[PDB]
Amino acid sequence: AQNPNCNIMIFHPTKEEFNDFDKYIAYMESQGAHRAGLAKIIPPKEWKARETYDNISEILIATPLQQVASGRAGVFTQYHKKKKAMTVGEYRHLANSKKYQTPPHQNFEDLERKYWKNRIYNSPIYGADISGSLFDENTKQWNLGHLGTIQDLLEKECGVVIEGVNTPYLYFGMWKTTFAWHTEDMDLYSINYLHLGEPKTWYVVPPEHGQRLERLARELFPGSSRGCGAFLRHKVALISPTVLKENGIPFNRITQEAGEFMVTFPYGYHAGFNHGFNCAEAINFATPRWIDYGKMASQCSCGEARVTFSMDAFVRILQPERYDLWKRGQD
Ligand SMILES: O=C(O)CNC(=O)C(=O)O
Ligand SMILES: [Mg+2]
Ligand code: NI
Numbered sequence: 001a002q003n004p005n006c007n008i009m010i011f012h013p014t015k016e017e018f019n020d021f022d023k024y025i026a027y028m029e030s031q032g033a034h035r036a037g038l039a040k041i042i043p044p045k046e047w048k049a050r051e052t053y054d055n056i057s058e059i060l061i062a063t064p065l066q067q068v069a070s071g072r073a074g075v076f077t078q079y080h081k082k083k084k085a086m087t088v089g090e091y092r093h094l095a096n097s098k099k100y101q102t103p104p105h106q107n108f109e110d111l112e113r114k115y116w117k118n119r120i121y122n123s124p125i126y127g128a129d130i131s132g133s134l135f136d137e138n139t140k141q142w143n144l145g146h147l148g149t150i151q152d153l154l155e156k157e158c159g160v161v162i163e164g165v166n167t168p169y170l171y172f173g174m175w176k177t178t179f180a181w182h183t184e185d186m187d188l189y190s191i192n193y194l195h196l197g198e199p200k201t202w203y204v205v206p207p208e209h210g211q212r213l214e215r216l217a218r219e220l221f222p223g224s225s226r227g228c229g230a231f232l233r234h235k236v237a238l239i240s241p242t243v244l245k246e247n248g249i250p251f252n253r254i255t256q257e258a259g260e261f262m263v264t265f266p267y268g269y270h271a272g273f274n275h276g277f278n279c280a281e282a283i284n285f286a287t288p289r290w291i292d293y294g295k296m297a298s299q300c301s302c303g304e305a306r307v308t309f310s311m312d313a314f315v316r317i318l319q320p321e322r323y324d325l326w327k328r329g330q331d
């Protein structure tokens with residue numbers, strides 16, 4: 001069995017190996033990468049996402065989100081308070097302001113310590129989930145706006161043609177902006193490219209151990225757990241590495257830098273934070289191996305999780321018994 005300890009693996013594809021996306025995902029899996037829940041892919045030196053980032057300041061962040069925490073330093077929830085629209089250039093200035101800028105630090109480890117110690121006492125503003133792409137149309141390899149669609153994958157594997165579309169999203173981050181513990185919608189894969197700026201630290205639980213994290217989360221957020229049998233789908237709960245280690249939950253950590261891809265695998269729980277001003281692009285995707293995870297994915301039916309148009313067909317086709325309840329939660 002490859003990668004039996006479920007370590008995060010890092011890949012350095014050649015330019016030739018970077019041509020066929022599906023093939024390379026399958027190669028990584030042949031080496032056990034999925035066991036970790038997360039892999040890093042460093043693109044060949046010949047590759048570029050686009051020529052420059054000099055012209056991105058006019059992009060609009062229509063609904064910047066201020067991430068307000070409640071709880072204790074290692075165990076908290078966050079809610080998103082909507083703020084007035086601002087451009088990327090306005091957001092970058094805000095991120096770099098004394099109120100929001102990254103503090104002096106020695107190295108990633110020192111910054112990580114500062115994050116866990118101090119995150120709850122601040123409310124950073126995140127430009128998340130902005131439909132769009134920063135890949136040049138002429139970038140043919142690993143261009144997140146030109147991947148095979150999940151609807152086409154389900155059609156190819158199962159024979160059923162469905163409605164829906166699959167497009168990427170931009171994330172503009174600052175110091176302490178946070179992504180809560182989650183798996184993807186319908187336990188899909190995700191791929192994330194860090195276009196520019198400061199790093200992003202990830203934490204991940206191996207898919208084979210995801211239920212351990214769920215059980216801890218029910219313990220730690222007991223009101224939330226009573227409200228919803230899949231409340232991690234709400235994407236509001238944080239648990240620190242220290243707390244995870246105290247409770248024996250298997251996990252790993254890695255820092256992604258600008259110019260690097262991360263792939264999250266089906267049912268790989270992940271969480272993390274941004275080091276300073278940055279811009280990432282991410283999209284969900286599927287492979288044949290995903291279908292079995294999609295059929296077994298938990299779902300939130302309490303109303304909170306509220307998701308894209310395109311999840312309807314996945315639930316309807318893969319989870320017909322759950323569909324009527326889930327759709328009531330949509331409505
Ligand atoms: O970058 C972020 O804020 C969150 N990204 C992901 O959860 C992802 O790419 O799957
Ligand atoms: Mg612009
Ligand atoms: Ni994710």
Ligand SMILES: [Zn+2]
Pocket residue numbers: 227228229230231233234300301302303304305
């Ligand atoms: Zn719910």
